């Protein structure tokens, strides 16, 4: 039998296309200055920050460090694999509405990908970081979008290297523009693009920091950066703490 919440979530899944970029900015701009934005940088998983924020959260959204080409990225280290194995996310990512995002991204034949985002409403989290049931599932809205594959660019088309950073910059602003458009209060962000895709965690953490200080200033209530980091140097975790000190 199908798990509770899946049908509602899949049917509410919705595609944002590149041609709606200006719609997303106007939503951000209109929402600027609405709160005293509280923000933190943590070492929790993306669904652990979500799950503790839930009971406090008017409108809770989290970012999927998604594949551009296959829902769930075809599958252990990776965060989207984590979200798919412990929630209904996959059932939403394979939905009919969502298909143009993978179809176009594959057709682009560019490691920078395109500007489609998938909005999955009320995705039920079913299991903890350790994989047993939750009391009851806890729903979270999930914004899925692919960071540019900086690794692939370096190895397959270095000529797009200078475009890497502007691409992640404008796509992040679409990411929070979707969160503003869907009127979220609590945003779970993190080391977007910084693992498999090999983006500089310094640039990523900062690019956020700029937007939460510029166009996204005050647009959200609480923004936590859940950055899992089991590497002893804690490189990703450190660059996010080091560079989000102004805002938190
Ligand atoms: N559950 C987690 N929660 C929070 N942070 C995490 C988690 N898991 C890893 N991190 C941290 O986040 C950093 C980046 O996690 P990555 O998963 O590589 O996302 P990308 O954007 O770089 O690559 C996306 C591709 O990887 C997948 O295959 C997708 O299908 C895509 O194909 C990690 O180094 C962790 O420190």
Numbering used by the authors: 29 to 103, 107 to 279
The authors write:
To clarify the effect of Thr267 on enzyme activity of DrPARG, we generated mutants of DrPARG by substituting Thr267 for arginine or lysine. Furthermore, we determined crystal structures of DrPARG T267R and T267K in complex with ADP-ribose for understanding the detailed interactions. In consistent to the secondary structure analyzed by CD spectrum, the substitution of the residue did not cause dramatic alterations to overall structure compared with the wild-type enzyme with root mean square deviation to wild type of 0.50 and 0.43 Å for T267R and T267K, respectively. The superposition of the modeled PAR trimer and the DrPARG T267K structure showed that the n + 1 unit was blocked by the barrier resulted from ionic pairing of side chains of Lys267 and Asp260 and implicated that the ionic bonding might be sufficient for establishing the steric hindrance of the exo-glycohydrolase mode. Compared with the solvent-accessible 2′-OH with n + 1 linkage point observed in wild-type, which were inaccessible and less accessible to solvent in the complex structures of T267R and T267K, respectively. PARG cleavage assay in vitro showed T267R and T267K mutants with decreased hydrolysis PAR activity as compared with the wild-type enzyme.
Our study demonstrates that DrPARG is involved in catalyzing the breakdown of endogenous PAR and DNA repair in D. radiodurans. From observing the structural peculiarities of DrPARG, we show that although previously thought to be an obligate exo-glycohydrolase, bacterial PARG could exert both exo- and endo-glycohydrolase functions.
